[PDB]
Each structure stands twice: as C-alpha cells, then as structure tokens.
Amino acid sequence: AGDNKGITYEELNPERFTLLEKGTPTNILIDENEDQGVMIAATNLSEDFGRVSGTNAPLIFLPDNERLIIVGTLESRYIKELTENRKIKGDELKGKNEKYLMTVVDNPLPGVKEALIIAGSDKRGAIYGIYELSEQIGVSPWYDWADVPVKPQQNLSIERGSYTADEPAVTYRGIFLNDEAPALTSWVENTYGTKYGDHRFYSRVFELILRLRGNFLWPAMWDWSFYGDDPLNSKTADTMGIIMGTSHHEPMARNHQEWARNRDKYGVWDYTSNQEVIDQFFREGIERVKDTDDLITIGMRGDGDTPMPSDEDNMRLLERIIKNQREIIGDVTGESPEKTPQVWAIYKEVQRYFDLGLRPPEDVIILLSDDNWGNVRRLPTEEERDHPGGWGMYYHFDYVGAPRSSKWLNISPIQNIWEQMQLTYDYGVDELWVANVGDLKPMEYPITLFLDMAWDPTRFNAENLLDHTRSFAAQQFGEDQADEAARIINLYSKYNGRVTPEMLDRNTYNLESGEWKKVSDEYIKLEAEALRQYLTLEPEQRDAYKQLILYPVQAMANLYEMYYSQAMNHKLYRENNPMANYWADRVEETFNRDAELSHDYNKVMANGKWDGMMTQKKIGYRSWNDNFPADTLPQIFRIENPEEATGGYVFTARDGVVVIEAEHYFEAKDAEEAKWTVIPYMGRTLSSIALMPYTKEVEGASLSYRMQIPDEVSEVKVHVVVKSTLPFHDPKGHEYRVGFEGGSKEIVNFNWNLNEEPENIYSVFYPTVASRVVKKDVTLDLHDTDDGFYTLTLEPLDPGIVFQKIVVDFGGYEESRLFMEESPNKRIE
Amino acid sequence: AGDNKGITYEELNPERFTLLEKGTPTNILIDENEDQGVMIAATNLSEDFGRVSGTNAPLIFLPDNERLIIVGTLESRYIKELTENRKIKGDELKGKNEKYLMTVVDNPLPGVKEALIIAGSDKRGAIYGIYELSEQIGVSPWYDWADVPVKPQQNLSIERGSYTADEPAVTYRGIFLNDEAPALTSWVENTYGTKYGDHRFYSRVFELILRLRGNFLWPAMWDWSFYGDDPLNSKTADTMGIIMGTSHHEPMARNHQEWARNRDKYGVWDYTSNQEVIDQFFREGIERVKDTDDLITIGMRGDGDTPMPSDEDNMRLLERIIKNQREIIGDVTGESPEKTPQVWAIYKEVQRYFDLGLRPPEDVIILLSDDNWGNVRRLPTEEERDHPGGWGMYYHFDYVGAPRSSKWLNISPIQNIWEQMQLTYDYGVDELWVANVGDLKPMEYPITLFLDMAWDPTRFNAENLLDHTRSFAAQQFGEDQADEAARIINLYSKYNGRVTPEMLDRNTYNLESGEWKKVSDEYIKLEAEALRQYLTLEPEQRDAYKQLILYPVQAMANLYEMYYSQAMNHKLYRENNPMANYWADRVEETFNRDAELSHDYNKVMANGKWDGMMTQKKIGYRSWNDNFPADTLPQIFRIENPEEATGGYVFTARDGVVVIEAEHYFEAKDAEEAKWTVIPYMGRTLSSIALMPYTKEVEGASLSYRMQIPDEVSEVKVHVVVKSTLPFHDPKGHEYRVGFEGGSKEIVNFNWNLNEEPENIYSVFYPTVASRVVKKDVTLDLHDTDDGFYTLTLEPLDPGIVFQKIVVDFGGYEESRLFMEESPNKRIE
Ligand SMILES: O[C@@H]1[C@@H](O)[C@H](O[C@@H]2CO[C@@H](O[C@@H]3CO[C@@H](O[C@@H]4CO[C@@H](O[C@@H]5CO[C@@H](O)[C@H](O)[C@H]5O)[C@H](O)[C@H]4O)[C@H](O)[C@H]3O)[C@H](O)[C@H]2O)OC[C@H]1O
Ligand SMILES: O[C@@H]1[C@@H](O)[C@H](O[C@@H]2CO[C@@H](O[C@@H]3CO[C@@H](O[C@@H]4CO[C@@H](O[C@@H]5CO[C@@H](O)[C@H](O)[C@H]5O)[C@H](O)[C@H]4O)[C@H](O)[C@H]3O)[C@H](O)[C@H]2O)OC[C@H]1O
Ligand SMILES: [Ca+2]
Ligand SMILES: [Ca+2]
Ligand SMILES: [Ca+2]
Ligand SMILES: [Ca+2]
Ligand SMILES: [Ca+2]
Ligand SMILES: [Ca+2]
Ligand SMILES: [Cl-]
Ligand SMILES: [Cl-]
Ligand SMILES: [Cl-]
Ligand SMILES: [Cl-]
Ligand SMILES: [Cl-]
Ligand SMILES: [Cl-]
Ligand SMILES: [Cl-]
Ligand SMILES: [Cl-]
Ligand SMILES: [Cl-]
Ligand SMILES: [Cl-]
Ligand SMILES: [Cl-]
Ligand SMILES: [Cl-]
Ligand SMILES: [Cl-]
Ligand SMILES: [Cl-]
Ligand SMILES: [Cl-]
Ligand SMILES: [Cl-]
Ligand SMILES: [Cl-]
Ligand SMILES: [Cl-]
Ligand SMILES: [Cl-]
Ligand SMILES: [Cl-]
Ligand SMILES: [Cl-]
Ligand SMILES: [Cl-]
Ligand SMILES: [Cl-]
Ligand SMILES: [Cl-]
Ligand SMILES: [Cl-]
Ligand SMILES: [Cl-]
C-alpha cells in the first residue's frame, strides 16, 4: 500500500474484490498492443503475484475469465472501451499527467462479472497504477534493491471505491548515480562482468525508480558513457519510461567521457577556438536522442568540474553558445527548439551573469543547485517565479569535494531533507528535482523520502514528517516492527548529521566535559536496541534489516567508539598513566571490527549479493579526498613496561573537591612482610588496594596522595571509602589514621558499630554490609604552604583494611553511589 | 582439562596415548566389585565418550583389549596389581585424602601393551580422577546444569607423564540449597512431578557437585526433608560419595520440617520442658545415618531461624545439651562419639558464650558464618587456631532477611568472594566450606570459584584471580570466546555488587550529576557487547551463553534503564515538562521487557528445560521480604494534554552559563500569518524552531527566554546556534535581533559570508556548511534588576531562520560539539 493504505485485506469478503483465492491469482487483462513499457510493468505485476502466492498471475489478452484485473492506458482497447461506456470516469484522466485510476466495477465488459480497473492517463500513469497494486499485495519497491521479503499470502481482497494518487507536483523526479567509484563500479563488475553500466544493469535501476514513482535519471558518468557504452541503454530507458538527463557540465546529450576518452582525436573544448568539432559533438548528440523524451542540458562550463577576460563580452559568449545549440536542436529534431525539453544549470560565473539578466529562452528549465551539503543557494524571487520553463533543484546525499568528501553512509537527517525541500517547493521550484545518491545504496531511505515529497510535498509538515518514516518501516518490516525500526532510522540519521564519518576524529567532541563519552555511549545504546530488534525478526527479514539499519548503526557506533578510544588513549598517554594501553587495544579492536562489519556486508549478507557495494574507505583521511591506500589504523601510543608504572600520581582540584581512586597514590610504603597489593576491579569504581597478606603486622605502612588545592581553603572534610570488612580479629574494630602530613591527623574506626547488638543490627549493620562499603569522614585543619601542594596520608592500624576511594571535600561534594568523577591527575617517575 | 591444562590433543601421536581413534573410544577397564560410587562415575565417563564421539566407551571387567583406560581405587584388583608390581607409585596415594594419580604406563598387565591409569587414594579420589578425564575429552561439569555443549571429536590423545590434583586443602567443600521457593521448588515439580526433592533430583545434584570436585551438601529444608521424603536420598548420597549435612539449627541429622510438619504430635522444642520427646527425635536421627559419613550438627538454637533468664546458667543448658547429644551418638553408633564427625555452628548468643570459653568437645568442627553478605564475622585467634576439630565457614551468594532479601541473580563480585575467602584460609579455617547458593542457578560461576578455591586456595592471588574466570569461560565456550566472555562475567558481577536488584530503585544513583545516566548507559554497553558475542556463537552454545551471561546482563541492563527512566519521569513531571510522558512510556516498556526476558528463560531457552528456575519476583519490594503479589509496575506520572504544555520555561544559571535548547522559550509571539513551528529532532540536540511557512513576512515575531543570573554579573556573551541556512532570498544574508528586553540589542548576520567568493569559499563557507550549523556571539551589557530575572529575546528579520540553541556565557562556557548540557529549568502555565 504505497498510495492508499488499509484497503487490501488478507481475507475475502462479498463486498470486496478478490485478487487471490486459495493460491490462485486473478488474471490480468491487457491489450497486446499496449505500450511496451506498460506491458513490462504488467509482466512485473504478474511475477509479483508469483512472489506472493507461489504462482504468477496469468497475463491475458482476451476477457476469458469471469473476473479480471484490467490494466492499460487511456488509448488501449479495453480501457478505451470502458471510458466510452462510462464504466469509468475517463474525464478524470484525459489530459492529466502521470495519473492512474484504480476502482472496482461490476460488469465492465460482457462475460466479465466484476473487475478491478487500473487506467493510466499516459504510459507512466499506467505503470504507477500497476505498481500501486504491486505494493498492495505486498511487494516493496525495495524487494530487490534492499532484499525486502514478500509476505506469502493465500487470499487477498481489495476494498471497493475509486483510488488515485492524482498528478505529481514535480514534473521530473529522479536520481543521479555519482561518486560511483569504487563501490557501484565494483558491484557492477562483480555482478555483470562489465567495466561499464550496460542495459542489464540500467533496466534494474529503471524498475526501481518506477516502483518508487520517479521518472528521471542522470546515469553514472565518472568512467562510463550511458549513451555510448550500450545502444540498448537509451532504448531501454525510452521503452520502460525513464527520462534520461546529463549533469550540469554535460551539454547536448553527450556524456563527459565521450569527450575525455578521445582528448587526442577531439580538440580542447574551448568554444571560440574549437567551434567546428564541438558543434559536431553537440549535433550527433541530439541526433542520438531525438524521438526520445530525454532532457537536453544546454549551456557550457568546462570539462571536469571546473568553469571557464570574462565579464561583459564573456557573458555574450554563453549567450551565443545557447543560440546555436538551439538551431542544432532545430535542424535535427525537425520541429522548432521549444518542442524539446531543455535544462540550463546554474553555478559559479552565472549567478553573476544572472543579475544583468542572463536568462535562457523562456521555455528552458533553470536548474538551481544546493551547496553540496543539503542547503539551497538561490531561489526565485516573486518576480522571476514567473519563468515559463520553470525551475529545478539538484540536491546532495553524497559529495566529493570540499571541505572533505562524504562517500560512505547516509549523512542526511530526515528533518534536514524536508526542511530545505519544503522551502524549495514553496518558492515555486517544481519542474525538476534530482538528488545525488552516490551508489544508490545505502541511501534507500532518503531516496524514498525525496521522491515521495516530489510527488506531493503538500502532505508533509513538521508534525507528521516521521509518519512517513513509520510507514516506510512498516512496509519493509511489518506493522509489528515499524515504530522501533523508524525510531532507529531517524536517530542514526540525526547522529550522522552531527558530523560526517570522514570528518569525525579524536578531536570532534569535548572529552573533559564528558561529551565524547555521552555520544559514544549513546550510539552503542542505539546499536543495542537495533540488535534486540534484529533477534525478533524472521530470518527472511535479516538482510534487509542489516542493509537499512543494522549495518549503518553498528558501523557508526563502532567508528565512534574507535575515535573516542583514541581520544582516551592520548589523554592517558599524556598523563603517563598505563591505562593508555587498554585504550590503545580498544582502538585496534574497533578498527578491525570495522573491517569485520564491511566484510559481512559485502561477502556474507545475502550470500554476497552486494559484494562491492560496501568497499569505500573511511578511516585515514588527511585532506578532502580519499586518495590514501586503504583504511588506516588511527595513531596510538603505549606506555612501555606498564607494571613498573605505578605511584607518582599527583592530583589537581576541580569543582570543589579532590576525588581520588585509592590505587592512584603518590607513594606507598610497605609494611614489615606485608606489601601493598592492588585488587583489580574491586569496589564500586576503579579498584581496591590493601596490605597482603592479612596475617602480618601492618606496623609502619602507609599510602600517600599528593594534591593541589587553591590557597583560599582553610579546612577540609576528608571522605575515605573502604570495603565493609567486619571486626573479625578484634571486636573493637578496624582503625586507620588519616591526616595531612605536616598537619593534624585523626583516626577512624569504621566498623566498631557493625554488629548484631540491638542498637546497631538494623540501624547501621545490615544496611552498610549489604552495600559492601563504609564511608567515613573527618574534618581536618589545612595548614599553610607556599606551593599549594599537600600530601594526604592513610595509615592502617589493623590488618585487612581494603581502601577504595578518597574525596577531600571543600564545598563541591555531591552525594552519589560511586563517590564522584575522579579529579584531574598525572604520573611522574 | 580442569586440573591439568594442555595435555589432551585433537590429533594422535606415537609419543601420546590414544583415547579415541577414528570414532572408536578406548575401553575402560574396571573391577566389577569396585566401589559402586566409583562404578557410577566410570559409567558416566563411558557416556561422556558417547557425548564426544557418538559411541560410548565400552566399560569392561577383563583386560581384553591391547590398550586400556584403567580406573579404580587402591583396593580394587587391577590397581592393587599395578602398585604391587611397582608399575605405579602407590606410595604417592596410600594414606592420602581424595587424591588421584593419572599416568600412562607401558605393559601394565600381560596382554595390555599400553594404558592410561587413573588410581584414586579412596572413593572420591577415584571419582575425581575419572571426571578429570571427562573434562580432558571436553565434557564440562556444566554440560547438564547449564547446557554447555560437548565439542564432537574423532581422535583424542593424551600426553604422557604423571598427573594429579594432590589432596584438597578443605576437608568438606559443598553447597546449601536454600531460599529455594518459588524457583527451585517450581522446577523440581515441573521436572519430576514431586512437591519434594526425591532421589532422582538429588542424584542429579550429586553428579554436579562431584564433577566440580566438591563432596558436601546441605539439602533444601524450607518445605522438604532430605532424609524423610525419600529413603533413597541418604542411600544415593552415601553410594555416590556425597557427605550430607544440615544447617545450623538442624541438630542430629533431623531436617527441620520433620519437626515442623508434626508440631501437633511433637511438643514445643524447649530442651528443659520437652526433654523426653526431643531426645527421641535426636536418637532416631543418628540411627538413620549411622554407617554413613554424614556430618552431625550438634547444639541447639530455636526452631525457625530464631534463638532462645539466660547468661551464666543458660550457657550451662547448652553445655548439657551437647553432653547428652554425644551419649546418644555413642549409644547408637556403638563406637565412641569422636568417631563420628560433628559440627557446632556459632551465631548470636554463642559468640558471647565464646569468651568465657564455651567450646565444644575438641574433635568437633566449629562452623563460623559470614554476615549473610559475604563478610566474615569472627575468625580464630592464634591461640584458638589450635582447635583439634578445626573450623568451617558458611558463606552467602543469596540471602533472605535484612536489610532486604536478595533472591534473583548473582550479586557476588569475583573479587569479593576471593578477598574474603583467602583471608578465611589464611587464618586456619579449612575443615568445612559451604556456600548458600539459593536455587543453585544462576550461581554457576561463584560456585565453581568457591569450590576451586576450597581445593587449592594457594593458587589464587590478586594478580591471577581473573585467570580463573578466563579458564572457566574457555571451558564453557571455547578458547576463541574466552577473553570476551570472562570480561563480561567479571563486569556484570561487579555492577551487581554495587547494589542488589531488589534494593535498586529510582533513588539509588545521583541523577543531577549524570551518575544515573552513566551507569544505565554503561550496563547497556555491556549488553551490546554480549549481544555481539552471542551472534558469533555456534547454535549449540546459545543456551549456555544465555544462562551464564546473556540473561543476567540483559535483565540487569533492562532493570537499570527502567529505574533510570522512572527517575527521569519524576524529574520532568516535577518540572511540568511534557517529556515526562516519554519516560513514563519507557518505564512501561522496560517493565514489560523484564517479563519478556524471564518468559524466554523459563519457556523457550533450551525448550523450557529450566521452566520455573527464573520466576522469582524482583520489582515491587517495599520491605525486606518478597511478600507482595508479583512484579509491579513502578509508579509513573503523566502530563495530561501535552500538546498545550508549551512555553513558560524559565531557566536558572549553573556552572557559569545558561544553556537553553531553542524550543524551551518562555513566550513566542507569532508573526502575521507565519507561526512558530517546532521541528522535532532537528539539529544536533533537542529540536529546532522556526516561523512557517517561509513565504510570509516575519515582521514582529519573537521568541522570549526567561532566566535567572546571579546579581554579581555585569556583561554576558550570548551564543546563538542556527541551522546553516544560506542567503537564498537576498545575498546580503539573514539577520536576527538578539538582546535582553529592557537592555541593549545587537543584530547578527550569520551567513553574509557563506558563499563561493574566494575569501570565503574554503575559509568559512564549506567548513560551516558541512557542519550544518552556524554559531554567532554578541557581547551584551547586563542591566540592573532586583529579582535577578532576565528575558532574552530573539527576533528574526528574514524568513527561514532555524533557531536551535542558545547559551549565555559569563565564564563557564566550554567549546563542544553539542554546545553543553542544558541548564536547570521548569514550566509554568
Ligand atoms: O581543504 C580545502 C580544499 O577543500 C580545497 O580543495 C578543493 C575541493 O573541491 C574540489 O573540487 C572537486 C574536485 O573533484 C571533483 O570530482 C572529480 C570527478 O571526477 C573524478 O574522476 C574519476 C575518479 O575515479 C577514477 O577511477 C576515474 O578514472 C575518474 O574519471 C575525480 O576523481 C574527482 O575528483 C569534484 O566534483 C569537485 O567538486 C577542488 O578541486 C579542490 O581544489 O582547497 C583548499 C583547501 O583549503
Ligand atoms: O528493615 C528492618 C528489618 O530488616 C528487620 O526485619 C528482620 C529481617 O530479618 C529477618 O530474619 C529472617 C526471617 O526469615 C527467615 O527465612 C524464613 C525461612 O523459612 C521460610 O518459610 C518457608 C517459606 O516458603 C513457604 O512456601 C514454606 O512453606 C515455608 O516453610 C520463610 O518464608 C522465611 O522467612 C530468615 O532466614 C531470617 O534471616 C527477621 O525476621 C526480621 O525481623 O526489622 C527491622 C527493620 O527496620
Ligand atoms: Ca559511496
Ligand atoms: Ca506546473
Ligand atoms: Ca577496510
Ligand atoms: Ca533464587
Ligand atoms: Ca588439616
Ligand atoms: Ca514477572
Ligand atoms: Cl521482473
Ligand atoms: Cl496526492
Ligand atoms: Cl564498451
Ligand atoms: Cl517518442
Ligand atoms: Cl522531440
Ligand atoms: Cl509546511
Ligand atoms: Cl501523528
Ligand atoms: Cl550538525
Ligand atoms: Cl566539567
Ligand atoms: Cl580495564
Ligand atoms: Cl609497593
Ligand atoms: Cl569510636
Ligand atoms: Cl591495633
Ligand atoms: Cl549419566
Ligand atoms: Cl594442587
Ligand atoms: Cl513424601
Ligand atoms: Cl560407611
Ligand atoms: Cl560411624
Ligand atoms: Cl594471597
Ligand atoms: Cl596473567
Ligand atoms: Cl558496592
Ligand atoms: Cl553537576
Ligand atoms: Cl523523544
Ligand atoms: Cl505558537
Ligand atoms: Cl555584517
Ligand atoms: Cl529585511
């Protein structure tokens, strides 16, 4: 159900029209001389009933059956017979652009008791109506290009009534295959054996664009020539009903490589110098595509993506170029020039030629363009909205250039596409919308949004935008999966809008403020939610879910954690803290995970159907272009010999406290026989530390913490957190001596009251014990010093004390389960 | 490989002993009059070769085969023949406790060219050696009780040499089934049809304890009587080689329920009052277990978990009770009393009886006990370490009582078990170690650690502790999975140590400081890492992974997010912010997910093998006990009519700034025709807001933000972040007027310089555009006010400005990608 939702049911009903009964499809009646592109779509619908039911819908040319699905254009014999007998409201289609009419009617023809009619105003309107039914029975436009499975059915009925999508609001609506190496090129080679895009590949692109209800394509042009590499390319597009175009610097239906490949035979591409050969270039161009409905790019820039002393009389060079471009069209097409659709794209030295009134002939479409990052540059004023030929918009989902290429994943928030396209429509630009899609994949969702907006931008607003995302998800994964799948698509798109993967690195986010950890943790949360959903899917759904959701999310969550880890590696390495080695390991592991994930996408997902599609490098950019060998491991640093890199931590106060994890001492003096032993992971946070073993005297032992406090401070509250050890050796309890060396020192008895005596047993004892820790505080007078450095000192007086955390409190203390983030520190010897 | 690692290979070798060749196991030779418990283990080993190879190892009674695995005790005929011919070092086993000897020997007996010998010093030492081989060939002790699959093999050889575990350091090592309703009781009923634990159930518990190398059990005693409910219970334990005991208040081999069930027939349980019937109770107790090696609890507390005016002569009551308890043992056992192992547990009014020297007879074991939360209360002094009978330790992994029961999941950090048990051993307590395991599951890992420490505590230290976890993981999931599986077990155990699930709620963690978000996000990260690992497992491994890792992690990560969400719900509801409704929904969803997860564990995992094991309630505690109906939805609050709950936000400064998300205005005046429209999710953070549509004049419109600043502030820097809209309508750019109403106001032109002119194109233009936002700052003079409240005002002057975020900066501003955490605020009308 693309256009009309909730009219096809999975049970039959007397007051509904049966499309499929106990496995057998209803036959499709078609005029055998129907437009060949419409027959192709009808054949695809016949096979779509095959995908649903197990048997193809018989495609017939005579009303043999008592009930029928009758398809065709207004001019085909059966539709023509229906409008003439007023069985169908033909007035609602005659003259209309790309419109279908879908309605059940009783006794359409003699011998037919009841039929579903799909009548198109023209070729494409018939195709669209057919594919509307295709969706109704459960074949997503993405059934091939993103492996979206078809729910098998045994019976289908459709509600009566008259159904339409009306006419599209934008005349030309399509995509540009661009930035296509190495991905799309690798995939076309692996799949078709061709170092070019041939008509097998392009017809497969055409069916998609048509199922999506678009009509337009700029073919790939980096190393290919859509018109020259295969003579069926133009012929197939013309038959199937795609309008072909060329990009802004490819005038006159010549693909750029047709000139490049023969720079030796051809001249220089300077109109005044090389006029003769270039005019011949242009002519055979229009010669090749006359009798098709292709858009003719007119004008002239440079060759490559460069422009072309100028100013007054240079503007008159362009004027001239358009003039004789049009007589060339006239001499070839036979008709006059305004009978051939033409488009003049504007860029650099043209917005400037705009003001003195450089406009093309009235009939020509003026193709505006975005900034390569989704923001429109110029729009028509109220005065020039008049323009008869109308206006286009070229929009980027993918871009190679400044400030850095973006070639890997979708980077376009849903809100950003809509917010800028709604503006585009509201200012009158509605003749051509074409979006740069990179390799097509993985832009599946923005493409669907882009084209659905081009059909009817009026049905989108800020409140209902994500309703579109939810509908898309329900189509791909089913009603039960839809809310959560759309939620993920929206979120990962938004995260990707924050910074492109190619421009993400260790310095993107703020590390001290905790921002890096937030966005890294939060993307992994999204990955966890996508993993949970993935386990609930039916097997036949996993490949589509991975292509539309799981791989983008996993690959980005992994990329984020990699750079976050690099940022932590450098911080700890600067600080001389051997924990740097852990984060170095994480960088390595996440870097390799990135290759694991793309290897899966290419080689394992869908049995390697998409091998090549996910081979763009992404890690190792140094300039704007991806001209470096391959994904490169971000630089990491390691502390040699990390076991003898202990002690010597000195802290600096921040935000009212000095919070210290107990193992980050400045020095530790061992006892007689018993030695300071750190216990990894023990406690609520970093680790614990204790003299071992517990059978030895602790006499003389001490831990020492070096810290800097602002001179304005006169007394402090010292919190020491230890493990909730009980008084096992001696009922009077465990004591330790805390104090600033050079100043006053109190002793703490932290478990004298942890027992089963009535006043303690439930008031203190069981509560503290079930928490596993005890926290004591002394209040200590801070003496004077000239450098501001102090040495806090912890001296145990009984065995088995497990020190865990210290916080000196001079204002900024916050009650909390983990006893606050550790204060800044670094290491010395 | 439990005891000896890296001696069994998957290929054969001339200098190794073949255990399995091309599918055929080597035969096991056993004396047919061998101890019946040893034969049982040998039969289990025969079937373990079946689990590995597909065919069971033939178990034979004569040396028919040229090569053999020869098992038995020192007294069985074949082992006896080997030690006498000095083929085996019998001196290394005679007298030793529970020791095996495993060694290849050539020509052991005539007609046998080569055999692997497994000789035990006694019954249990033989069993242990057999199960050592069981592990060598790949059968985990957890192959049944946690579904750990057996890697199929076609050939196995074992290295030559002499192999042993020596003797255990703790004489009795076992578990207490306790807190066993509703889980273990439900599972036993579902599995065996019995509202009691019968000998089918207990033998299955025995095989586990033996494969784990323990020898001790306190059976379940809440509603069952191990000795009374089934006469094969004692007989099976005696045959298989388990030492049975009873808990601290179950004297004389009587299970508590044997008294409870007949409170009517029996008397009151007051020794002085009801002496006659209680002595008869005690007697038939010892009568029932004489001729077995069971531990006899002596002493007397109350019935229930309560004690029993006292002081001087009351201590003489206990003295007397022990005295005649021992003559009862003497009159029944025939021998004297010190020939029967006895244990006196100490609790409440006994540590006090301790000081005046209340000690039992010298031969009796004194069973100390922890605090029910893993911390030891008393340990022997150097003077009383002398005690001939020795000392025990009762340790909790599970507990019903103060301050709140803990009955759902493992809560014991690995470090905490070790740190307190290493102390226990070092102080001389090495006769009995028994751990309260709840329902056994899901304590699989702490049980293995506990018992492995009881075998040889000397091999554990702070540095190598987690080596044990890694070895355990490699056994359950394979070398390739081990590091990451152990990492997860360690972490989730640590997190659970921070607070028990039953005591977790909205107020556990600090929300303002971001601590709640940290621990919630971090547990979900652990879940994501466990999910990733789960997808790499072979199918046959998934059930074990879910039981030992995935379900604890998912269930806790979900529980944490639930309470975190509740905490957010209440904060936003207090603040009158309709976002509260989102968090209410999350509480509901996570609450139901908790039931999804346990439904899976019970009913779907392993085809419902474990149905009942995971039915403990956990959500809805109000006191210490789980006496409430069922898991209950934590209380949430919702803002009625949340669409008309906009505007009226007023902010309070914190930490040097006022950070405002653009949609949290105090008031918004609409324009003529164009209306303030908020665009969900748009931008880097909360959302965007803009006058729509863009075709209307914006004259007069404004947003207003109300905020409180400390009176000490005289001027501010105001940062406004908008979308990077370009100057599409008018090349001079977009302008807006920012200022404090009642004070000065500057205007900002944020895109006058976003174009392709040479000085802008790569310096500013492409960088800002690819970032999707622009940030401008004015510096504004702050005027005087008496309440400290100000009204910042944003007035657009051109169409299409997308406001996203504001931060007024008076010191605390931090450069960051998201422009800082939003400042505190609330809502009014
Ligand atoms: O950082 C700042 C820089 O941004 C600034 O650098 C400018 C960036 O913008 C660049 O213009 C882009 C150049 O690249 C064009 O794409 C072409 C398309 O043709 C491709 O050729 C094919 C490649 O694949 C092969 O296999 C095949 O054989 C080829 O036919 C070519 O690879 C691409 O580069 C873009 O469309 C332009 O937008 C500009 O050149 C830079 O100068 O400098 C300042 C610095 O501060
Ligand atoms: O919050 C503070 C409180 O902590 C304090 O409350 C005390 C908590 O400690 C309690 O002692 C525990 C009581 O419960 C015992 O377990 C029994 C075992 O027997 C069970 O009976 C079976 C239940 O299942 C049935 O199906 C079966 O038929 C029964 O046989 C019974 O359910 C359990 O309760 C524990 O072992 C004790 O440790 C103490 O009673 C409380 O007073 O009060 C102060 C407050 O501030
Ligand atoms: Ca790409
Ligand atoms: Ca029009
Ligand atoms: Ca790679
Ligand atoms: Ca339990
Ligand atoms: Ca001993
Ligand atoms: Ca439940
Ligand atoms: Cl087809
Ligand atoms: Cl419509
Ligand atoms: Cl070719
Ligand atoms: Cl034509
Ligand atoms: Cl034409
Ligand atoms: Cl709108
Ligand atoms: Cl809605
Ligand atoms: Cl952004
Ligand atoms: Cl900070
Ligand atoms: Cl670590
Ligand atoms: Cl040291
Ligand atoms: Cl004190
Ligand atoms: Cl002391
Ligand atoms: Cl068995
Ligand atoms: Cl050992
Ligand atoms: Cl019974
Ligand atoms: Cl015996
Ligand atoms: Cl005996
Ligand atoms: Cl030790
Ligand atoms: Cl190690
Ligand atoms: Cl804790
Ligand atoms: Cl804070
Ligand atoms: Cl939300
Ligand atoms: Cl409003
Ligand atoms: Cl300016
Ligand atoms: Cl203006």
Numbering used by the authors:
A (entry chain A), B (entry chain A): -1 to 306, 318 to 838
Quote the paper:
The xylan-specific α-glucuronidases from glycoside hydrolase family 115 (GH115) specifically catalyse the removal of α-d-glucuronic acid (GlcA) or methylated GlcA (MeGlcA). In this study, we report crystal structures of a bacterial GH115 ortholog (wtsAgu115A) identified in a metagenome from an anaerobic digester fed with wastewater treatment sludge. Furthermore, wtsAgu115A eluted from a gel-filtration column at a volume consistent with a dimer in solution, which suggests that wtsAgu115A is a dimer in its active form similar to other GH115 xylan-specific α-glucuronidases.
A crystal structure at 2.65 Å resolution of wtsAgu115A originating from a metagenome from an anaerobic digester fed with wastewater treatment sludge was determined in complex with xylohexaose, and Asp303 was identified as the likely general acid. The sum of φ and ψ for the glycosidic linkages between the xylose moiety pairs at +2NR and +1NR, at +1NR and +1, at +1 and +1R and at +1R and +2R are 47°, 27°, 57° and 13°, respectively, which indicates that the xylan backbone is forced out of conformation upon forming the Michaelis–Menten complex. The xylohexaose-bound crystal structure forms a Michaelis–Menten-like complex, which reveals how the dimer interface of the enzyme orients xylan in the active site guided by residues from each protomer of the homodimer. If this were the case, a distant residue could activate the active-site water nucleophile, which was also suggested to be the case for cellulases in glycoside hydrolase family 6. The wtsAgu115A–xylohexaose structure revealed a proton wire leading from Ca2+ site 1 to Tyr403 through the active-site cavity via water molecules w427, w446 and w484 and likely beyond Ca2+ site 1. Thus, the proton required for catalysis could be delivered through this proton wire. Interestingly, upon formation of the Michaelis–Menten-like complex, Tyr403 moved nearly 170° and the nearby histidine residues His246 and His247 also underwent conformational changes, indicating the importance of Tyr403 in particular in catalysis.
